[PDB]
Amino acid sequence: VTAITKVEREAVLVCELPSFDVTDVEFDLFRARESTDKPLDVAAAIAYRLLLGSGLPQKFGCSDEVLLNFILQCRKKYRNVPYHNFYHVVDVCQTIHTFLYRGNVYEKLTELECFVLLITALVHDLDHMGLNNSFYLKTESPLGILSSASGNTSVLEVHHCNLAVEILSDPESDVFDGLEGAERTLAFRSMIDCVLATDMAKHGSALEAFLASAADQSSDEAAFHRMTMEIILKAGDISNVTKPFDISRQWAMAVTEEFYRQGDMEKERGVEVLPMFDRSKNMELAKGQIGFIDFVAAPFFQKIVDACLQGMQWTVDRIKSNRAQWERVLETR
Amino acid sequence: VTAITKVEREAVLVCELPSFDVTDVEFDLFRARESTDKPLDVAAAIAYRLLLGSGLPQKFGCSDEVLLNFILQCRKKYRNVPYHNFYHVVDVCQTIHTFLYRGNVYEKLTELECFVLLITALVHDLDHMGLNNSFYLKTESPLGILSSASGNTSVLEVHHCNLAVEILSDPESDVFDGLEGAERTLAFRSMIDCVLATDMAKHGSALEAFLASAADQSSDEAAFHRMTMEIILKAGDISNVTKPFDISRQWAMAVTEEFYRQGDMEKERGVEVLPMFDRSKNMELAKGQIGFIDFVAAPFFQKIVDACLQGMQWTVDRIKSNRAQWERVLETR
Numbered sequence: 105v106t107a108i109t110k111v112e113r114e115a116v117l118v119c120e121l122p123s124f125d126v127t128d129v130e131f132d133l134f135r136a137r138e139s140t141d142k143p144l145d146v147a148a149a150i151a152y153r154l155l156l157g158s159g160l161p162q163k164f165g166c167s168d169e170v171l172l173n174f175i176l177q178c179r180k181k182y183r184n185v186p187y188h189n190f191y192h193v194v195d196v197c198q199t200i201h202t203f204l205y206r207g208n209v210y211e212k213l214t215e216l217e218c219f220v221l222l223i224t225a226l227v228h229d230l231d232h233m234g235l236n237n238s239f240y241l242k243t244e245s246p247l248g249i250l251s252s253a254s255g256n257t258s259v260l261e262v263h264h265c266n267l268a269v270e271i272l273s274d275p276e277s278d279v280f281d282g283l284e285g286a287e288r289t290l291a292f293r294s295m296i297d298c299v300l301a302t303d304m305a306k307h308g309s310a311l312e313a314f315l316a317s318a319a320d321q322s323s324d325e326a327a328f329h330r331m332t333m334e335i336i337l338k339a340g341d342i343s344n345v346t347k348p349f350d351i352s353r354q355w356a357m358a359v360t361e362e363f364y365r366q367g368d369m370e371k372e373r374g375v376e377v378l379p380m381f382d383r384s385k386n387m388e389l390a391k392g393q394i395g396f397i398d399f400v401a402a403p404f405f406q407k408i409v410d411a412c413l414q415g416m417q418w419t420v421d422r423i424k425s426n427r428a429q430w431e432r433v434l435e436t437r
Numbered sequence: 438v439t440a441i442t443k444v445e446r447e448a449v450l451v452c453e454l455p456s457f458d459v460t461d462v463e464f465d466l467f468r469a470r471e472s473t474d475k476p477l478d479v480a481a482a483i484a485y486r487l488l489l490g491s492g493l494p495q496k497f498g499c500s501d502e503v504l505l506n507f508i509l510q511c512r513k514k515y516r517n518v519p520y521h522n523f524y525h526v527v528d529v530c531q532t533i534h535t536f537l538y539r540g541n542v543y544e545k546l547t548e549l550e551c552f553v554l555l556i557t558a559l560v561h562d563l564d565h566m567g568l569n570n571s572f573y574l575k576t577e578s579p580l581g582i583l584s585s586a587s588g589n590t591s592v593l594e595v596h597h598c599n600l601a602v603e604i605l606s607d608p609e610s611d612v613f614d615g616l617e618g619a620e621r622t623l624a625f626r627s628m629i630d631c632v633l634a635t636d637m638a639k640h641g642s643a644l645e646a647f648l649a650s651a652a653d654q655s656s657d658e659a660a661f662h663r664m665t666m667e668i669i670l671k672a673g674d675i676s677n678v679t680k681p682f683d684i685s686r687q688w689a690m691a692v693t694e695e696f697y698r699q700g701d702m703e704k705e706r707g708v709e710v711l712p713m714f715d716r717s718k719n720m721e722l723a724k725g726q727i728g729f730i731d732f733v734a735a736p737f738f739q740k741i742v743d744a745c746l747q748g749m750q751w752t753v754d755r756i757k758s759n760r761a762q763w764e765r766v767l768e769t770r
């Protein structure tokens with residue numbers, strides 16, 4: 105586990121560019137990436153600022169140096185793919201921060217759980233290659249074969265967890281080293297439960313388990329806390345459609361290109377290419393977004409907001425706002 | 438010289454190429470070919486639009502009709518082989534157009550030279566029969582014997598030049614008929630020099646001379662211009678790996694099938710059959726593309742971009758992206 109050098113840390117500590125408020129729901133990561141010729145350092149600085157600003161690391165014995173080392177260890181494990189790169193996870197971290205503190209979801213969780221969520225956002229897609237679980241299973245790729253044999257279909261999610269554990273094995277980057285007993289165990293278990301919950305194949309059950317844990321008041325508080333954590337990481341993971349249109353549009357372009365590259369690799373392997381990943385069809389970007397909004401995002405955010413997270417109402421408003429604009433994109437032309 | 442008919446020209450003029458931007462570096466010729474049941478006319482229409490859009494034919498006294506007649510006379514001379522057919526030369530023409538105008542290489546040449554380059558792209562592989570120079574020499578075929586006896590082993594290249602001269606000997610299809618004296622001589626000599634430079638046996642020497650000229654501020658201007666033209670036609674000729682992955686992959690498959698057909702004929706004739714031309718060795722495409730990228734394409738484009746053609750940086754970027762994509766294919770196999 106190649107430890108981080110003081111040089112690597114300095115490159116980050118120098119940033120902290122003005123004109124940006126990382127806690128705002130209107131924060132523009134794309135604008136931030138284009139404000140310097142070292143976007144990876146700015147991205148790292150944003151994550152660093154969000155965590156220290158929450159005041160959480162300090163409270164759990166995690167020094168500023170260990171925090172920065174952890175962030176840099178995570179950064180090194182992300183590939184140069186169109187969407188599932190370091191920027192996506194920094195965005196998820198920033199977004200979760202807004203849900204917790206602008207949406208007041210922090211009231212439903214302990215400080216430790218909020219800390220774990222912000223940390224988990226940074227490890228939730230470690231070493232993603234730009235290919236989804238279905239690709240590994242459809243092509244019988246070695247990792248897919250292992251997943252089938254071992255009994256867990258969440259190919260990537262288990263892989264991300266393995267790497268998160270690897271990073272935390274280094275005392276110099278173990279943001280949970282200041283914890284002991286039940287707290288340290290909860291940090292690891294909750295982190296892992298949340299990453300595993302990002303497999304969209306569990307979307308339905310996760311949402312249902314949350315709504316059930318939220319509805320029934322005779323519900324187990326511990327269960328509600330864990331489910332709220334899982335739902336918040338999930339919400340952050342599919343939050344692209346809840347951002348100002350220009351930002352949402354850029355994220356959509358990025359995910360679409362990555363999907364198209366998977367489709368191209370599938371054509372090379374001679375396997376089935378779903379329309380969503382078929383670059384040939386030259387589909388309208390707007391059509392894919394409206395579809396995701398109608399069948400996935402809109403129902404998800406409306407349900408969790410009405411069931412418990414009232415403070416996140418703006419996500420529902422923005423989704424509807426963006427859907428209308430996507431319609432105009434197709435219309436006006 | 439069987440003159441082109443009005444009906445033949447009309448079949449091309451009726452193609453409007455909806456949804457295509459022939460000037461874009463991501464233009465998909467395969468998509469254009471699958472857009473109608475008359476791909477040959479679409480291809481001709483693409484070449485026609487590229488030349489007219491350059492605004493060059495008009496400047497040198499070449500009417501729209503003569504230009505179209507020329508394009509059609511060239512088309513009639515290409516055969517139904519897997520790779521070296523009419524689509525390859527139209528692709529080279531389109532690719533060179535992007536190098537000249539998207540890559541700004543036009544700044545290094547006169548308008549006449551840019552005109553000659555676009556025209557030369559269309560004649561550079563005339564009457565190719567799907568067999569390389571080595572095949573003719575190995576088998577001591579009539580064409581190979583003539584090349585040897587006459588002193589020039591660029592078997593096919595000299596042949597393509599002969600057919601180009603034939604087409605231009607009729608005013609009706611002579612895109613250079615509006616030229617006289619020195620300009621006409623330069624047009625023909627430069628066209629011929631460029632075609633002769635496509636022989637890959639001269640790849641290293643051609644690249645070296647260009648780089649030496651580019652690095653020399655006192656290089657003879659005429660010589661530098663000539664070498665720049667030769668380098669640009671060569672660049673267009675080996676530009677497959679500088680295109681979006683799927684397009685690049687489709688070209689690679691055509692190249693392989695043509696090589697396999699030569700290998701089959703070599704076996705029947707009992708001559709040496711390189712592994713690359715052997716169906717039985719079923720070499721993996723990923724390794725084949727990475728090999729060409731590492732030993733030929735990457736260094737060629739990086740060197741010319743660094744030495745003088747800074748505007749073509751995107752070719753280097755795409756080659757890098759495609760290599761990484763083939764590496765992902767290997768990693769997940």
Ligand SMILES: [Mg+2]
Nearest residue numbers: 228229260302
């Ligand atoms: Mg994921």
Ligand SMILES: [Mg+2]
Nearest residue numbers: 561562593635
């Ligand atoms: Mg040739």
Ligand SMILES: [Zn+2]
Nearest residue numbers: 192228229341
């Ligand atoms: Zn994610």
Ligand SMILES: [Zn+2]
Nearest residue numbers: 525561562674
């Ligand atoms: Zn060629």
